Amino acid sequence: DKATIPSESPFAAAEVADGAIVVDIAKMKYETPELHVKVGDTVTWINREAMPHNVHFVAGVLGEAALKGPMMKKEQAYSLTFTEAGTYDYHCTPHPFLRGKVVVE
Ligand SMILES: [Cl-]
Ligand SMILES: [Cu+2]
Ligand SMILES: [Zn+2]
């Protein structure tokens, strides 16, 4: 696969370090819709609102299987580490028009 999962379940956003690579979700937007990172970088999504959100990479994107992330409640977070250069689109399962992209060089 082209990424690994530090934590299979969501965790408390307060645990994320300042200066960690963070994508906020709010007002039905990934606050950084095209994120540029390097191989080995760990990306953390944080849900800032009461509507639950996830990140969903369809089959083909990070491997032959889809990576459907767990639903994050308000102030919950979820990380992925990108291990291979490429460009990876994702969306939120229940809200397919909430979408983003990670560019890994
Ligand atoms: Cl499916
Ligand atoms: Cu959503
Ligand atoms: Zn809904």
Which ligand is the nearest neighbour of the Cα of 68?
1
Which ligand is the nearest neighbour of the Cα of 93?
2
- Number of Cβ within 10 Å of residue 54's Cβ equals 21
Report domain extents, the chain.
Answer: 1-105
Which ligand is the nearest neighbour of the Cα of 71?
2
Which CATH number is 1-105 given? 2.60.40.420
Q: How far is CA 58 from each of CA 21, 67, 79, 90, 99, rounded to the nearest angstrom?
A: 22, 6, 17, 7, 12
Give the list of residues 6+ apart from residue 69 with CB closer than 8 angstroms, or none: 45, 54, 55, 56, 78, 80
DSSP track, 30-77: ESSSEEEE-TT-EEEEEE-SSS-B--EE-TTSSSSS-EEPPPB-TTEE
Ligand 1 centre to CA of 68 (Å) is 9
Ligand 1 centre to CA of 39 (Å) is 27
Resolution in A: 2.1
Ligand 3 centre to CA of 53 (Å) is 9
